[PDB]
Amino acid sequence: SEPELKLESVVIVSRHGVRAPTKATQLMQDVTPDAWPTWPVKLGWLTPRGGELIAYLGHYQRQRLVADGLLAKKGCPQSGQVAIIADVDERTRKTGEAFAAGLAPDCAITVHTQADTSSPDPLFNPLKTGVCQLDNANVTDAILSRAGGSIADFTGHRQTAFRELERVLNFPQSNLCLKRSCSLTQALPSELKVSADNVSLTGAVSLASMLTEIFLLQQAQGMPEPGWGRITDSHQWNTLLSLHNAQFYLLQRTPEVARSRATPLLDLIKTALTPHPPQKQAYGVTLPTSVLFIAGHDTNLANLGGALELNWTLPGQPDNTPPGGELVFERWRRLSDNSQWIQVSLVFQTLQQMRDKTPLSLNTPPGEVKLTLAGCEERNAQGMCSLAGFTQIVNEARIPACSL
C-alpha cells in the first residue's frame, strides 16, 4: 500500500575480534607494582575465543538476514551473494573467517585481502601508504580545539578517570612513584604529535588509552580478576574506558583527520550501497551484492563516525568501538514507489555477553543502537535517510585526493 520496505543490501564494517595484547613494555611494568597476567595465545593475534565471539555474531546475522528474507534459511548462499573483505593483518583475516564460519558453517566463503599481506592495504588507511596527507596546521588547530584548548586542559578536566585508573594500578606503589603528590598525568606529560601521515598523543593519555583497553580485553577473554580484581562494578568500567574513548575522540573522530582516513571506505560503502548492474570491483569482488562484510579496526569505525556525523554510546559496552563491533549500513526499497532508504546502526556484544560468551540468536540478540545521520534532512518514519541524502552526505565528506 505505502509504508512497506524490503531489505535489498547490507554492508557491515566490523572491527576485528579480541586480540591478545603485545608483550608488556617497561613503561607498563613501571606504572604498577603488580605483574601483568600473560596471554596463552600468540601475542597480537586473534584469540580463539575472540574468533568464537565473532562466529556468534555471524550466526546472529544469518538468522536475522533470513528473517528479513535476504538469505535462504538453509544451505549456502549463492556464489557472490556474500562477500568478505579483510585488512591484511592476522586478526582481521581470521575475523573475516570466523564471521563466515558463523554465518554459513561448512560453506566455502572466501576472505578477500590484498595479495601482498606484508604491506599495508590503503583501503584501511590511505595516509599510511602516502595516497594523501593531512594538513598539519588545520589538524593541529582542530584537535587542540576539541580538546578544550590544550592537552593540559583536556587532561585536567578528566582527573576523575585518571584517578580511577591510578587506583586500579595501585599507582602510588609503583617504581614510577617510588623512584620519583604522585600524579599519572603529571608524571607522563602528554603532547600532540601531528605529521603529514599521522597524529598521536604521548604520555599519560596514550598510556591510559592503551591500559584501559587491556583491562576490557582481559574481561572479554574470560581471564579471572581483570585489573587484579580492582574493577568490580559497571561504573568503574565506564569511567576507565572513558579515557580510551577520549583519545579516539581526539585522534580518530576529529573531522579534519577522519574524512581523509576514511575516504577509501566511504567510496566502497557508497558503491556497495548504490543499486547498479553487478561488476568486478576491488579484490575481484562483485558489487552490488547481498551482504558485504569488511574486517577492519576500531580506528576505521571512529573515522566513519566522525566523517558521517554519527555519534553513539553503547549501553553495556564501555568501549565505543568494541572488538567485533559492527557499523551496519542497509539499503531498503519502498515497494510502492521504488524509493531507496539507508539505515545505519551499531551492532555489538555487551561486555557481559563477551564475558559469559553467551550465544546470540533472534531471542537473545547482541546489543544494538539505531543511528541517525546528523546531516540528513530527507528521512522516513523509521529514521532512515534517502539514498540521495546519504549519497550527498558521502560526496561532501570524502576527500578527493585520498581516493584510491
List keywords for this structure.
404 residues, alpha/beta, Rossmann fold, 2 domains, 12 strands, Acid_Pase_AS, sugar-phosphatase activity, EC 3.1.3.-
CATH class of the largest domain: Alpha Beta
The biggest sheet, with number of strands, parallel, antiparallel or mixed sense and barrel status, is: 8 strands, mixed
In CATH, what is the homologous superfamily of the largest domain?
Phosphoglycerate mutase-like
In what range is the share of β-strand residues? Answer: 15-25%
Alpha-carbon distance between the two ends? 43 Å
Assigned CATH architecture of the largest domain: 3-Layer(aba) Sandwich
Q: Fraction of residues in helices?
A: 25-40%
Shape: globular
How many helical elements? 14
**β-strand number:** 12
Order of H and E elements: EHHEHEHHHHHEEHHHEEEHEEHEEH
CATH topology name of the largest domain: Rossmann fold
Class by alpha and beta content: alpha/beta
Describe this structure in words.
The protein is of the alpha/beta class. Helix content is 39%, strand content 15%. The protein is built from 14 helices and twelve strands. The chain has helices spanning 26-30, 48-67, 90-103, 136-146, 151-156, 159-169, 175-178, 184-187, 203-221, 234-251, 255-273, 298-308, 351-355, 387-397; strands at 5-15, 82-86, 111-112, 192-195, 198-201, 279-280, 286-287, 291-296, 326-334, 339-348, 367-370, 385-386. A hairpin with a 2-residue loop joins β4 and β5 (198-201). The radius of gyration is 21 Å and the shape is globular. 1D-myo-inositol hexakisphosphate binds at residues 15, 19-23, 91, 261, 297-299.
